[PDB]
Structures are given as structure tokens and as C-alpha cells.
Design an enzyme around this catalytic site. Structure first.
Site, mmCIF file in Angstrom:
data_model
loop_
_atom_site.group_PDB
_atom_site.id
_atom_site.type_symbol
_atom_site.label_atom_id
_atom_site.label_comp_id
_atom_site.label_asym_id
_atom_site.label_seq_id
_atom_site.Cartn_x
_atom_site.Cartn_y
_atom_site.Cartn_z
ATOM 1 N N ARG A 118 0.838 -1.182 0.000
ATOM 2 C CA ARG A 118 0.000 0.000 0.000
ATOM 3 C C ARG A 118 0.871 1.228 0.000
ATOM 4 O O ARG A 118 0.582 2.194 -0.673
ATOM 5 C CB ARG A 118 -0.912 0.005 1.221
ATOM 6 C CG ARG A 118 -2.361 -0.320 0.932
ATOM 7 C CD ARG A 118 -2.511 -1.398 -0.126
ATOM 8 N NE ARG A 118 -3.861 -1.381 -0.672
ATOM 9 C CZ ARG A 118 -4.301 -0.504 -1.573
ATOM 10 N NH1 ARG A 118 -3.501 0.439 -2.058
ATOM 11 N NH2 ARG A 118 -5.554 -0.577 -1.994
ATOM 12 N N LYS A 170 -8.004 -1.451 2.306
ATOM 13 C CA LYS A 170 -9.279 -2.150 2.119
ATOM 14 C C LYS A 170 -9.608 -3.009 3.347
ATOM 15 O O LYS A 170 -10.759 -3.055 3.788
ATOM 16 C CB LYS A 170 -9.293 -2.980 0.817
ATOM 17 C CG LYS A 170 -8.965 -2.185 -0.472
ATOM 18 C CD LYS A 170 -9.414 -2.912 -1.746
ATOM 19 C CE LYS A 170 -10.727 -2.352 -2.292
ATOM 20 N NZ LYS A 170 -10.511 -1.156 -3.152
HETATM 21 N N1 LIG Z 1 4.368 -11.409 -1.236
HETATM 22 C C1 LIG Z 1 3.784 -10.631 -2.145
HETATM 23 N N2 LIG Z 1 4.284 -10.603 -3.391
HETATM 24 C C2 LIG Z 1 3.727 -9.839 -4.330
HETATM 25 N N3 LIG Z 1 2.667 -9.074 -4.080
HETATM 26 C C3 LIG Z 1 2.114 -9.049 -2.852
HETATM 27 C C4 LIG Z 1 2.665 -9.836 -1.846
HETATM 28 N N4 LIG Z 1 1.933 -9.622 -0.753
HETATM 29 C C5 LIG Z 1 0.970 -8.746 -1.052
HETATM 30 N N5 LIG Z 1 1.072 -8.394 -2.335
HETATM 31 C C6 LIG Z 1 0.183 -7.432 -3.079
HETATM 32 O O1 LIG Z 1 -0.040 -6.197 -2.345
HETATM 33 C C7 LIG Z 1 -1.089 -5.504 -3.092
HETATM 34 C C8 LIG Z 1 -1.963 -4.723 -2.099
HETATM 35 O O2 LIG Z 1 -3.014 -5.559 -1.577
HETATM 36 P P1 LIG Z 1 -4.435 -4.935 -1.088
HETATM 37 O O3 LIG Z 1 -4.160 -4.107 0.112
HETATM 38 S S1 LIG Z 1 -5.142 -3.844 -2.614
HETATM 39 O O4 LIG Z 1 -5.465 -6.221 -0.783
HETATM 40 P P2 LIG Z 1 -6.282 -7.244 -1.835
HETATM 41 O O5 LIG Z 1 -5.878 -8.626 -1.457
HETATM 42 O O6 LIG Z 1 -6.084 -6.778 -3.227
HETATM 43 O O7 LIG Z 1 -7.865 -7.039 -1.426
HETATM 44 P P3 LIG Z 1 -9.145 -7.568 -2.321
HETATM 45 O O8 LIG Z 1 -9.437 -6.432 -3.455
HETATM 46 O O9 LIG Z 1 -10.357 -7.853 -1.507
HETATM 47 O O10 LIG Z 1 -8.674 -8.900 -3.124
HETATM 48 C C9 LIG Z 1 -1.882 -6.603 -3.840
HETATM 49 O O11 LIG Z 1 -1.693 -6.460 -5.265
HETATM 50 C C10 LIG Z 1 -1.263 -7.908 -3.317
HETATM 51 O O12 LIG Z 1 -1.357 -8.954 -4.303
#
Ligand SMILES: Nc1ncnc2c1ncn2[C@@H]1O[C@H](CO[P@@](=O)(S)OP(=O)(O)OP(=O)(O)O)[C@@H](O)[C@H]1O
Ligand SMILES: C=C[C@@]1(C)CC(=O)[C@]2(O)[C@@]3(C)[C@@H](O)CCC(C)(C)[C@@H]3[C@H](O)[C@H](OC(=O)CCCCN3CCN(C)CC3)[C@@]2(C)O1
Ligand SMILES: Nc1nc2c(ncn2[C@@H]2O[C@H](COP(=O)(O)OP(=O)(O)OP(O)(O)=S)[C@@H](O)[C@H]2O)c(=O)[nH]1
Ligand SMILES: [Ca+2]
Ligand SMILES: [Cl-]
Ligand SMILES: [Mg+2]
Lengths: 188, 190, 328
Positions: free
Chosen positions: A140, A176
Site C-alpha cells: 500500500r 481495504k
Molecule cells: N508477497 C507478495 N508478493 C507480491 N505481491 C504481494 C505480496 N503480498 C501482497 N502483495 C500485493 O499487495 C497488493 C496490495 O493488496 P491490497 O491491500 S489492494 O489487498 P487485496 O488482497 O487486493 O484485497 P481484495 O481487493 O479484496 O482482493 C496486492 O496487489 C497484493 O497482491
């Protein structure tokens, strides 16, 4: 595989890139660009070798987004401090690329720390990649940051402040899964 | 080799690309301790990683709650589209167990395009097989512009299909930008 | 047998012109589009000259009070999109063009941004207006159009293939040079020799030569190009000579070192060429030789050739002079 306590997670992307990615007969269907990504990503890994970054450990690169962590080798919080000096040092690396690619690329850092896990996913290709809330946040911090600065958490900010670092509050940010919360930029 | 670093990438053509995501993941995330979460995830994913092999898809990477794979790598195939299809197919089936096995309404959102790629590795340290091209971005942007537990597909992915599948208009342009803005015709599967 | 040959230089160094000749010279017909393009250049020039007479210091007063309404005419048309080119235009262009105070303002051209097909096309309006008219090759070579993009020409000399690569020669256009850096045989760096009194457009501050001098540097000392040897075209030699002879603005003033300078032993002065012209055309070469010389490690080298682009007679000669060195 197992859990942990004080791991510091950093993401650094180069958002100027997604544009610069052309495909044409002239640039061999988008490869000659992939060539420059290589010349950079490499220039970055070249930093892992550094002695003063012996503690830094790269995890993966996501498109043109870099991911790396301090902590999995175990004042006590030196490893976060470390990381930040890493981030800055890519910008040194990057302003070297611009020089020679007749270009302008800024870096987009998100950083953090706290409870993670650090294992192997799927038997088909077994790969080292770290899960946890702690991580999602450092992401984030990336996706909602600013070119050429480092955006870090309320918790993180304090600690860095406890290390001869100065900081400024960007304000409030949505997560989120974690509502709204205060974030910070480091000052150079 | 003496001035650019050696490039471990090869152009590839007529490959189907898949992306898939977990609808309402953070509902699960808030539910379980960082540990017992990881398990259910590492669970399904290794199962996904597995159907892959059944369905003839080289998996690419896991990016948190996002999975993606491809058909036509490493080595070419005619059925290439059908595979990435038959993949999505098995995945919502697969995830449905995990709806029963928890009780929360977590589900899927597939998106599949077909085009050219690039593939291989970047930099020096910690290689991970990967893919790159607009066609790829496009598939990703169709994970973005999908709808829950339904399989998404492009103009192209219909053409590499020979309608052995019953489908209908998805019109993804009214979900995701890059779609609309690039004149993209999208479809769902029955 | 194939030679991926990329073509660099500052803005308006003269690139897509050398491209031009290689097509004239070494390649196998409805230029009716390129007329419209010429026509455009005419408007462009004359508007630009009147424009800054006011904008200048000192300001520049029209020789003939009559022409004032024509002035007015011009800038009443200046930004129109699809222009129609009615006959009054040329009557009024020529007029201003005839006006001595206009032509005395032309003399201060280095002091604002103006295309160098100016005088040449203005000198020949009446020929341009005839709706049966077709451009001479000379004319056609001088039609200047911004290079947005990059363009692959391919040709053959004695069944040896070439791949000419043309780039945008301006600041924002250099981000995409990289894409030609791999799988390049050798480089043509084109420089506008004559632009020693002028600044570039991009900011309107940086001296054009000085710009191109430390563009050269940035390439000759490039990380992905310590192999690749660079053929320097010291372009625009006609114009250069002209200014020197014209004597109007001094060189050392724009590049203070010329004053301490004297004339090189390997001097190969063109036959009948002026000793003072000879001084500068080489001196300028040696500002680039202080770069090529000062590094590179006998690991690549510099090929300096005085050139006028719009001179197929000089161009063939120096391209022969070049196909040559591709052998090594
Ligand atoms: N180890 C890792 N490697 C690569 N990307 C990662 C990661 N860990 C996290 N991310 C990425 O961190 C980014 C931020 O995740 P959000 O805070 S937007 O949570 P959301 O899961 O998208 O919530 P939803 O819409 O209900 O499915 C995402 O692209 C993750 O894949
Ligand atoms: C680098 C070249 C180019 C243009 C080529 C390409 O296809 C990409 O690598 C994909 C599409 C592609 O490689 C498939 C994986 C992934 C990781 C999706 C890439 C990124 O979105 C890249 O953009 C980025 O590096 C930044 C955008 C990242 C946004 N993603 C969206 C999906 N979530 C899960 C993670 C964040 C990408 C578009 O960049
Ligand atoms: N008098 C004279 N004019 C020239 C000479 N070379 C080029 N020109 C003119 O000046 C302009 C410069 O040529 P052009 O090819 O358009 O510049 P350029 O270097 O390609 O511009 P860019 O692509 O770097 S941005 C052209 O319009 C051409 O007519 C020359 O040697 N002498
Ligand atoms: Ca996601
Ligand atoms: Cl120049
Ligand atoms: Mg040009």
C-alpha cells in the site's frame, strides 16, 4: 516454514515504465525495452553484493516493481534503518541509468515492519516468498506513495525517528482490510 | 555479453494467458491468524499449481491473493486456448470446496486473453519465470474487469477456441478502464 | 553482409536529410503531398521573421510603412489550422520578403528560432505558387518536418545491406535511443557545425553546438557503447563557411577558446577554400576531438568528416568515404 516478528518489507516501483513500454517492428515487439529493465534490475541486484547490504535479501520483482526485506537473519532495529539506506542507494543506481538511457525515472518506495511468515508455496515450483498483513501494507505504501520519496507507517516512522531520521506526515490513507491510517515520508 | 548483460528472454506466439483473483479475500484475512490463513492459501494454490499440470499450464507466479499461468509455454500447443479455459473451469470448481470448508463467501474472478508474449528472467539474483507483453497486461486487466466465479475471455480467445463453448457478452468496458478505452469485446462462459 | 547503422544528433542537426540522400542515392512518385509540406514551411518562416522584429532588442523597424498592413495580414493568418494559401499570401510574403528592414531582421536570425530553409524558399516564392509546380530535389531535401518517432530505412551499396535508423533529435525524443543501442554496427552522429551563434529550442538557453558537444560526450562515453565506434559528420559546412566569411559574428565570442587557437598540421584545406574558413571548420572538429581523444581506450575511434547534407555531390563522396570503414 515458519513465522517471525520484526521483518522490514520494502517495495520500490518505477511507474514511468508502464508507458515507456512500446511494441513495434522497430523495438523488437517490446523486447528492446525488456532489455533496459534487465540493465536496471541487474544494476539493483548488484547492490545485494554490497557488504553493508549483506543483510538485505531480494524476494522477487513484480513487473518493474522491486521487493526486498531485512530481518530473516535472526540496536535491535538496525535492520529497518539499513533497508532505507538500501532504497536510497537504488536511486543512486537509477540516476546512473537515466544518465545513459537519456531518460527520467523516479522510484516509488513503500516500506514497513512486523509479523510475517517466510515459506514455500506450491510443490510444482517451490519458491521463497513472504506472506502476512505486514507485507500487504508495505505494498500500500508503494501503490499510494510519491515519486522520489519513501512513504512509511506510523509505527515505522517512530523507530526511524529513533535513528537520526526526520519525517513528515502525508496524512491519512485507506487500506481495504485495515480502514484508514497515518503515513509518512522520510526527509533526505 | 560484453556491454549489455545477457538476456534470458524468448519471443513466443499464440499463447493463452490467464489471471485469476480471490473475491472478498480480506474477509478471510481478518478471520484467521496470519498462520492458519497461510495454510488454506498454500493449500488451494498448490492445488491450482496442480490442475495447471493436468490442464497443460505452466504457472507463472503468486502475488499475494493473485494467481496466474499460461498455455503455450514452454513449448507450443494447438489446444493452447482450451487449456487456459479448462483451467478456469477447474478453479471455481476447486474454490467451491473452500467455501464449504470455511463458510465465508470467498470466490474467484478469472480473465483470459491470447496473443504474443515474452518470457524468461530478469536481473542476476533470484530468478522467477515470467511473461511480458500488452497481451499479458490485457489478460491481467481482465482479472480486473471480470465478474465473480465466472470465466472471462477476449475477442482473440474466442478465435483460438472454435466455439466448443457456450458463451455470452461480458462487456467488460463497463467494469475496467483499459478495456473500454481500448475497444475490447469481452465474453463470459456458460 | 548486413549493417544496423543508427543515426544520432541534436535537433535540426540534419539527420532525416542524410536519410534523404541515402534514398536519393541508393534507392528506387506522388511528391504532391510534399508540396503542401513545402508550402507550410513558407508560411512558417515568414511568420517567424516578422514576429520577432517587435520581440527583439533593439526592435526592428520596417523599411516601408506600406508593408505594415501586410505585417498585419500575416499575423491575422498565423495560427489558422487548415490553411488554403490564397494568392494574396505570396504577394504579401514576397512583399515583406522584399522589404529591406525585414531582410535586415533576417540578418539577426541567430537571435530567435527559425528554420534554415528560410532564405532558400523565400528567395523562390513565385516558383512555389504555380499550381502546376513540382519541387526540385534541392527544394525537396529542405522541406523540414519534425521527427516524432523513429524510422527504418533499408538500402544496398554493391549488394551490401544497410539499416539506417533515424531518431528524434530533441531532449524528450532521446529517451528512446536506447532501443537502437543493441545490435548496432557503428554510429553516425550528425552535428550542425554552423549553429555556433544560436541557442536550441528545448529551453532557448543552451547554445546549440555546446548542447551537441555534450550530447556527443554522453554517447562517446556511453555504457552500452564503449565498443561502437562513432562516425562524426560535421554537418552544414556551407552555412558555417558563410558566417565565417560573412565575418559578422565572431566565433571566439560564442566559444572563447578559438582565440588562442591556431591551424592543424594535417590540415587538408578544400581547394580555393578560405584560410579563415579552414580554421573554424577544423577547430570545431577539434572540440569534438578533445572528447573522442580523452577516453575510449583505443577500443573504439572517431571518424570526422566535414559535411553539407543538402549536397548529394558531397554526400555520396563521404558515404563512399564511409562504406569503406565498415570493413575493418
Ligand atoms: N508477497 C507478495 N508478493 C507480491 N505481491 C504481494 C505480496 N503480498 C501482497 N502483495 C500485493 O499487495 C497488493 C496490495 O493488496 P491490497 O491491500 S489492494 O489487498 P487485496 O488482497 O487486493 O484485497 P481484495 O481487493 O479484496 O482482493 C496486492 O496487489 C497484493 O497482491
Ligand atoms: C514491465 C513491463 C510491463 C508493461 C509488461 C507486463 O505485462 C507487466 O509486467 C505485467 C502485466 C505482466 O508481467 C504480468 C504480471 C504483472 C505483475 C501483472 C505485470 C505488471 O502489471 C507490470 O506493470 C508493473 O510493473 C506495475 C503494475 C502492477 C500492478 N499489479 C496489478 C495486479 N496486482 C495483483 C499486483 C499489482 C507490467 C504491466 O509491465
Ligand atoms: N544549408 C544547409 N541546410 C541543411 C544542411 N543540412 C540540413 N539542412 C537543412 O536543415 C534542416 C535540418 O535537417 P533535418 O534532417 O530536418 O534536421 P534533423 O537533424 O534531422 O532534425 P532532428 O531529426 O535531429 S530533430 C533541414 O530542413 C534541411 O533542409 C546543410 O548542410 N546545409
Ligand atoms: Ca489483488
Ligand atoms: Cl547541432
Ligand atoms: Mg529529422
Amino acid at each position: 516454514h515458519q513465522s517471525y516478528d520484526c521483518v522490514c518489507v520494502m517495495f520500490a516501483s518505477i511507474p514511468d515504465f508502464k508507458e515507456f513500454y512500446t511494441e513495434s517492428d522497430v523495438n523488437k515487439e517490446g523486447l528492446e525495452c525488456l532489455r533496459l529493465l534487465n540493465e536496471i534490475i541487474a544494476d539493483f541486484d548488484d547492490l545485494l553484493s554490497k557488504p553493508k547490504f549483506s543483510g538485505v535479501e531480494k524476494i522477487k520483482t513484480i513487473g518493474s516493481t522491486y521487493m526486498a526485506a531485512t530481518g530473516l537473519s535472526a540496536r535491535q532495529y538496525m535492520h529497518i534503518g539499513t533497508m532505507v539506506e538500501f532504497a536510497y542507494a537504488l536511486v543512486g543506481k537509477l540516476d546512473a541509468i537515466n544518465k545513459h538511457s537519456f531518460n527520467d525515472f523516479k522510484l516509488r518506495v513503500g516500506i514497513n515492519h512486523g509479523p510475517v511468515i517466510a515459506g514455500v508455496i506450491g510443490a510444482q515450483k517451490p519458491q521463497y516468498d513472504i506472506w502476512g498483513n505486514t507485507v500487504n501494507v508495505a505494498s500500500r505504501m508503494d501503490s499510494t506513495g510519491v515519486l522520489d520519496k519513501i512513504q512509511v507507517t506510523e509505527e515505522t516512522s517512530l523507530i526511524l525517528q529513533t535513528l537520526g531520521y526526520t519525517c513528515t506526515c502525508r496524512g491519512i490513507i485507506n487500506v481495504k482490510g485495515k480502514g484508514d491510517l497515518k503515513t509518512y515520508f522520510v526527509n533526505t | 555479453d560484453m556491454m549489455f548483460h545477457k538476456i534470458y528472454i524468448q519471443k513466443h506466439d499464440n499463447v493463452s494467458i490467464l489471471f485469476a483473483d480471490i473475491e472478498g479475500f480480506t474477509s478471510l484475512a481478518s478471520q484467521c491468524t496470519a498462520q492458519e490463513l497461510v495454510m488454506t492459501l498454500n493449500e488451494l494454490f498448490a492445488r491450482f499449481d496442480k490442475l495447471a499440470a493436468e490442464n497443460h499450464c505452466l504457472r507463472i507466479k503468486i502475488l499475494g491473493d493473485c494467481y496466474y499461468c499460461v498455455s503455450g509455454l514452454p513449448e507450443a500447443r494447438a489446444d493452447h486456448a482450451h487449456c487456459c479455459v479448462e483451467m478456469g473451469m477447474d478453479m471455481i470448481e476447486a474454490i467451491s470446496l473452500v467455501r464449504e470448508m470455511t463458510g465465508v463467501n470467498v470466490n474467484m474472478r478469472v480473465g483470459i486473453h491470447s496473443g504474443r508474449v515474452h518470457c524468461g528472467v530478469l536481473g542476476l539474483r533470484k530468478w522467477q519465470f515470467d511473461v511480458w507483453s500488452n497481451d499479458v497486461t490485457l489478460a491481467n486487466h481482465m482479472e480486473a474487469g471480470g465478474k465473480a466465479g465466472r470465466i472471462h475471455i477476449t475477442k482473440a480467445t474466442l478465435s483460438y477456441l472454435n466455439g466448443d463453448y457456450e458463451v455470452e457478452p461480458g462487456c467488460g468496458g463497463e467494469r475496467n478502464a483499459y478495456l473500454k478505452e481500448h475497444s475490447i469485446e469481452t465474453f463470459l462462459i456458460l | 553482409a548486413t549493417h544496423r547503422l543508427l543515426l544520432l544528433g541534436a535537433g535540426e542537426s540534419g539527420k532525416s536529410t542524410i536519410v534523404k540522400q541515402m534514398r536519393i542515392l541508393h534507392v528506387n512518385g506522388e511528391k504532391a503531398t510534399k508540396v503542401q509540406d513545402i508550402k507550410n514551411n513558407l508560411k512558417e518562416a515568414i511568420e517567424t521573421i516578422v514576429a520577432a522584429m517587435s520581440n527583439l532588442v533593439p526592435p526592428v523597424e520596417l523599411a516601408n510603412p506600406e508593408n505594415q498592413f501586410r505585417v498585419d495580414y500575416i499575423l491575422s493568418v498565423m495560427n489558422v489550422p487548415d490553411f488554403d494559401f490564397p494568392p494574396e499570401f505570396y504577394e504579401h510574403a514576397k512583399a515583406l520578403w522584399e522589404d529591406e528592414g525585414v531582410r535586415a531582421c533576417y540578418e539577426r536570425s541567430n537571435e530567435y528560432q527559425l528554420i534554415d530553409c528560410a532564405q532558400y524558399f523565400l528567395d523562390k516564392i513565385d516558383v512555389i505558387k504555380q499550381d502546376d509546380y513540382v519541387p526540385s530535389d534541392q527544394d525537396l531535401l529542405r522541406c523540414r518536418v519534425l521527427t516524432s518517432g523513429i524510422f527504418e530505412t533499408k538500402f544496398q551499396v554493391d549488394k551490401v545491406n544497410f539499416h539506417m535508423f533515424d531518431v528524434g533529435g530533441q531532449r524528450d525524443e532521446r529517451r528512446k535511443w536506447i532501443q537502437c543501442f543493441n545490435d548496432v554496427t557503428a554510429i553516425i552522429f550528425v552535428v550542425a557545425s554552423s549553429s555556433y551563434n544560436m541557442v536550441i529550442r528545448e529551453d532557448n538557453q543552451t547554445n546549440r553546438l555546446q548542447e551537441a558537444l555534450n550530447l556527443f560526450k554522453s554517447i562517446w562515453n556511453n555504457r552500452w557503447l564503449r565498443t561502437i565506434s562513432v562516425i562524426l559528420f560535421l554537418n552544414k559546412q556551407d552555412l558555417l563557411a558563410e558566417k565565417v566569411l560573412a565575418g559578422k559574428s565572431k566565433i571566439e565570442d560564442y566559444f572563447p577558446e578559438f582565440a588562442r587557437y591556431t591551424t592543424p598540421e594535417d590540415a587538408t584545406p578544400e581547394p580555393g577554400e578560405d584560410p579563415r574558413v579552414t580554421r573554424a571548420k577544423y577547430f570545431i572538429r577539434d572540440e569534438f576531438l578533445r572528447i573522442s581523444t580523452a577516453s575510449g581506450d583505443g577500443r573504439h575511434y572517431c571518424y570526422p568528416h566535414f559535411t553539407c547534407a543538402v549536397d548529394t555531390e558531397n554526400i555520396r563522396r563521404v558515404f563512399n568515404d564511409c562504406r569503406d570503414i565498415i570493413q575493418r
